Symmetry: C3
Subunit: 146 residues, 3 copies
């Protein structure tokens, strides 16, 4: 019986693995156990953030060079800089994930973050993978992670 129930499960694993690859083409990227997926359009930080959380995930939060490179592929493909989840709204100069935890990785472009105009508390990632603090009111590519 187990011999049969397992043949059912392994058949399922096979079909599921194929559908996973199909799902990620062409708006997603898998890295480790995390999955980045772009919505394809642009929006202000607040709305971008609400879209991701309501979908059961959150805004892209690269925690390593590999994750950042994975996210960059999506930005490059859509040719639109994207918003990350991190902000320094609570304490100027100190960026944190939505959980309040401090960054464990960063890829700031030379000269950033600079809080230009005295009001750049959000983060965007360029097609070259570098980060820049930007005003939360600007519209950027929406990319969520799951």
């Amino acid at each position: 019986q187990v011999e049969a129930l397992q043949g059912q499960v392994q058949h399922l694993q096979a079909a599921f693995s194929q559908y996973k690859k199909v799902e990620l083409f062409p708006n997603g990227q898998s890295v480790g156990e995390k999955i980045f997926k772009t919505a394809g359009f642009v929006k202000p930080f607040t709305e971008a953030q609400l879209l991701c959380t309501q979908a059961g995930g959150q805004l892209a939060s690269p925690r390593s060079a590999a994750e950042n490179a994975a996210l960059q592929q999506l930005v490059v493909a859509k040719n639109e800089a994207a918003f990350l989840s991190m902000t320094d709204s609570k304490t100027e100069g100190k960026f944190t994930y939505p959980t309040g935890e401090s960054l464990v990785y960063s890829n700031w472009a030379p000269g950033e973050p600079n809080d230009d105009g005295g009001s750049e508390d959000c983060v965007e990632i360029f097609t070259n993978g570098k980060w820049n603090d930007r005003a939360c009111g600007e519209k950027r590519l929406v990319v969520c992670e799951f």
Copy 2:
């Protein structure tokens, strides 16, 4: 017979993650039903063909809960969508594709009104309310699975 339970556990976790990814950003889950928009507009007939060939049917909200779920997609695309119901067989009596009569409705004030004497299809607005409309018009294609 335990390493098999380990596989099922891994599958449940992975499949659960994949479901969320799939629904973003064009689908809405509610109960055992799934609404998904194609992202473009089409006349009723073509819109209906697209859903049936895909193994489903045009959105058919049967409760305040399903309508709210469907409303989220319409609002997201800012484009009214077609429902599956029509009164083309018997004017004034809207039915599902199967044939049964509506078990739920959310008509806007004064609707349905067969305006111009030619509105046998139904569209749902960004506000969730329904309006009977000419089937030849082009509206957001949303199917249910």
Copy 3:
């Protein structure tokens, strides 16, 4: 534990069967054990090929009338001719799959392939389903198989 486990697998099978239909709508077509999926946009051959391979698949390669007809439904729906994976770049006049093996099926339009202008080594499929050898530098609908 079996009865409780048989219930889980049954639930998984039911949920998966539903999600396969959801996934294929509206850019995919399933035929046999193969799945065709269009990215929705056009690109030259080299760019198209890279996109599919990096996603873990390859450009559409219909190996039968059934597969070709399924691929045709996508091209018709997007109203855009697509690139297939085969080319005769190595040996002029001899089309092969990415693996180098010879074609086991073809659906050439009358008179094709004609290596027009002596520079057509790629293949495109029209909305009517026929094939035509074309210059790889042209932009065509991107469709991958998994």
